[PDB]
């Protein structure tokens, strides 16, 4: 090469170097005027990304932006995503009206009433794993010993997946979400699909509790959902149900320990916890791989033209750092109003599990402050290995220690 390498479509996604700040490239996008920006995906395709808060709400509500993953022009951010692409879709990949007919089969499990009613169960699960970790003595891996098991046990009960098989499906879920190549991603999905097919057949003998048992005994027995779809739907809920909250827990611990005055204020006044959870959601925005869209018609946005067949990624981490919405947006402030953040999306696909996630993180933070207020990282912040921007944000390992008490 013998010419400058500046490009008007930088590589996307980018990797975080700090868990709670944007990648520098993302900061550059945040500062570029306009709602949209060109980028180049891993294979060479260019696509649009959305980089401003209001425009992200508007485009997430635009029916000309389809969630159809199996569309040829759907933006793929890694060779692994094309596992979810050439696979039968759960409702996260459907458009209305099909999307609502499938999502409505699951919503009874996620109502505000039901979630509020799970609080004692979540508290029991959180405190049990906390006990086992603390009794095991420092040091510890917060991911394997706490952040992952807690939401796994909860979502497994919700679904009717037996927690006994946790080692299998927890490992399979890891391999699907984080793979760098396509085939290891396909294999993880097919191990999962295979396990899920057996559970249905098992339900097809003795009716079990949980959402999967319910969908087997009703919608499936009425032909209203296909077996492939039920598997896909159960897989989406299982994986989302435990990988997202696990990442929020580990990244929130890292973040709070870098803001000790806010963490101390939080411990001193537990009425701040719900607002702190909202702020952490806005600030950490762990699900950026959760904004892909493909346009089925030309879309004009503020003087820029999205043409039919162009991919669009609504990047909610950047949108949540829009300073015309959140004053001083790169500062963590558990007292701020984080209302209207996009960590959960917006519109018809807005996160089904959002209030379960909020409940989990409130109980988790309270239990950590109750039972191990001296928790600290057993390594410095820049000895941690963060995941790349091609997957759910977080850490695969979080070595922690505490002052032992008896
Ligand atoms: C803990 C933090 C969580 C975050 C930050 C998060 C983030 C998101 C985002 C951004 C979307 C939108 C995807 C899109 O627009 O294409 C989404 C959708 C979804 N989330 Fe969550 N999620 C979290 C927890 C959960 C939990 C605990 C569940 C439990 C099952 C869950 C289940 C779902 C489902 C099923 C959808 C698809 C909804 C639809 O397409 O109608 N999420 N999530
Ligand atoms: O997007 C799919 O189709 C998907 C399929 C199978 C399993 C998980 C899937 N998605 C997924 C995986 C992790 C976190 C989130 C989300 F952030 F949206 F909640 C979504």
Closest by CA position to 282, among listed 222, 237, 353, 331? 331
With beta carbons less than 8 A apart as the criterion, state whether 236 and 92 touch: yes
Burial level of 136, CB count in 10 A (0-12/13-18/19+)? exposed
Has 349 been labeled as part of a binding site? yes
371 touches 130 (CB < 8 A): yes
Phi then psi for residue 294, to 5 deg, are -130, 130
The closest of 326, 299, 302 to 310, measured between CA atoms, is: 299
Domain that holds residue 329: 4-403
Residue 344 CA: distances (Å) to CA of 122, 225, 300, 355:
21, 26, 25, 10
Whole-number Å distance, alpha carbon 293 to ligand 2 midpoint, is 14
> Using an 8 Å Cβ cutoff, are 17 and 386 in contact?
yes
Cis peptide before 17 (omega within 30 of 0): no
Q: Is the CB of 153 under 6 A from ligand 2?
A: no
Q: 325: which residues sit within 8 A by CB, 6+ positions away?
A: 53, 54, 340
Say how far apart CA 307 and CA 236 lie, in whole Å: 30
Contact 170, 163 (CB under 8 A): no
- Cα 297 to Cα 320: distance, rounded to the nearest angstrom: 27
Helix (H) or strand (E) holding 202: helix 182-203
Measured distance CA(78)–CA(41) in Å, rounded? 8
Compute CA distances 98 → 93, 166, 296, 311, 380, whole Å: 10, 32, 17, 21, 48
Q: Is 239 in the pocket of ligand 2 (CB under 6 A)?
A: yes
User: What does the alpha-carbon distance between residue 64 and residue 25 come to, in Å, rounded to a whole number?
Assistant: 28
Is 216 within 8 Å of 200 (Cβ atoms)?
yes
The tokens describing 140, both together, are 């510890």
Reference 343, options 333, 353, 328, 331; nearest CA is 353
Count CA atoms within 13 Å of residue 21 on its CB side. Answer: 11
- CA dihedral defined by 47, 246, 91, 180, rounded to 10 degrees? 40
Q: Are 29 and 316 in contact (CB under 8 A)?
A: no
Q: Locate all alpha helices (DSSP H) within 24-165, ordered by sequence.
A: 24-31, 53-60, 82-85, 98-103, 112-117, 119-135, 142, 149-159
Tokens at residue 208, please? 């079990």
Closest-lying ligand 2 atom to the alpha carbon of residue 232: 6
The residue among 151, 100, 103, 102 whose CA lies nearest residue 126 is 151
DSSP one-letter code for 222? G
Q: What is the largest CA-CA distance in the chain?
A: 69
Query: Residue 292 and residue 12: Cα distance in Å, rounded?
Result: 12
* 92 in contact with ligand 2, CB cutoff 6 A: yes
Q: Which token pair is 92?
A: 């996260």
Is 293 annotated to bind a ligand? Reply is: yes
Residues in the chain: 406
β-strands 46-50, 311-314 pairing: parallel
CB atoms closer than 10 angstroms to residue 116: 10
C-alpha distance across the termini of the chain, in Å = 64
Radius of gyration over every alpha carbon of the chain, rounded to an integer in angstroms: 21
Between CA 405 and CA 6 the distance in angstroms is 56
User: How close is the Cα of 384 to the center of ligand 1, in Å?
Assistant: 26
Q: Is the CB of 236 under 6 A from ligand 2?
A: yes
Two tokens, residue 238: 């299982």
By CB atoms closer than 10 A (0-12, 13-18, 19+), residue 389 is buried
| Total domains present in the chain | 1
Task: Assess contact for 340 and 100: CB atoms under 8 A.
Answer: no
Q: Where are the alpha helices (DSSP H) in 204-298?
A: 210-217, 227-257, 260-268, 273-284
- Give the C-alpha separation, 212 to 176, whole Å: 21
Q: Beta partners for 386?
A: 395
313 bridge partner residues:
49, 292
13 — phi, psi (to 5°)? -80, 175
Residue from 35, 86, 89 nearest 60 by CA: 35
Question: Which tokens is 179 given?
Answer: 């793979």
Q: What token pair was written down for 45?
A: 């395709």
Locate 88 and state its tokens.
């039968």
Nearest C-alpha neighbor of 145 from the set 162, 127, 130, 164: 130
Q: What is the CATH number of the domain that holds 235?
A: 1.10.630.10
Is 227 within 8 Å of 200 (Cβ atoms)?
Answer: yes
- The reply, when asked if residue 296 is annotated as ligand binding, is no
Q: What is the DSSP letter of 11?
A: B
């Amino acid at each position: 090469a013998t010419t400058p390498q500046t490009t008007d479509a930088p590589a996307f996604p980018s990797n975080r170097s700090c868990p709670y700040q944007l990648p520098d490239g993302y900061a550059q996008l945040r500062d570029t005027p306009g709602p949209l920006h060109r980028v180049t995906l891993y294979d060479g395709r260019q696509a649009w990304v959305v980089t401003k808060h209001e425009a992200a709400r508007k485009l997430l509500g635009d029916p000309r932006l389809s969630s159809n993953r199996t569309d040829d022009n759907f933006p793929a951010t890694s060779p692994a995503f094309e596992a979810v692409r050439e696979s039968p879709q759960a409702f996260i990949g459907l458009d209305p009206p099909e999307h609502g007919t499938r999502r409505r089969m699951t919503i009874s499990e996620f109502t505000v009433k039901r979630i509020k009613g799970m609080r004692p169960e979540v508290e029991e699960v959180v405190h049990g794993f906390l006990d086992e970790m603390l009794a095991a003595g420092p040091t510890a891996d917060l991911v394997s010993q706490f952040a992952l098991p807690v939401p796994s046990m909860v979502i497994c009960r919700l679904l009717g997946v037996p927690y006994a098989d946790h080692e299998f499906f927890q490992d399979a879920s890891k391999r699907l979400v984080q793979s760098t190549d396509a085939q290891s991603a396909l294999t993880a999905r097919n191990d999962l699909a295979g396990y899920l097919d057996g559970l249905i057949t098992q339900f097809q003998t003795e009716p079990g509790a949980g959402l999967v048992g319910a969908l087997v005994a009703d919608q499936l027995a009425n032909g209203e959902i296909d077996r492939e779809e039920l598997i896909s739907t159960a897989m989406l809920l299982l994986i989302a149900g435990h990988e997202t909250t696990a990442s929020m827990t580990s990244l929130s611990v890292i973040t709070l320990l870098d803001h000790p005055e806010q963490y101390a204020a939080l411990r001193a006044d537990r009425s701040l916890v719900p607002g702190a959870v909202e702020e952490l959601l806005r600030y950490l925005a762990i699900a950026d791989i959760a904004g892909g869209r493909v346009a089925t018609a030309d879309i004009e946005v503020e003087g820029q033209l999205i043409r039919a067949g162009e991919g669009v990624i609504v990047v909610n981490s950047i949108a949540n750092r829009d300073g015309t919405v959140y004053e001083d947006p790169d500062a963590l402030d558990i007292h701020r109003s984080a209302r209207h953040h996009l960590a959960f999306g917006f519109g018809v696909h807005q996160c089904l599990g959002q209030n379960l996630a909020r409940l989990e993180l409130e109980v988790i933070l309270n239990a950590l402050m109750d039972r191990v207020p001296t928790l600290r990282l057993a390594v410095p912040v820049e000895q941690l290995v963060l995941r790349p921007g091609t997957t759910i944000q977080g850490v695969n390992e979080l070595p922690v220690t505490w002052h032992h008490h008896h």
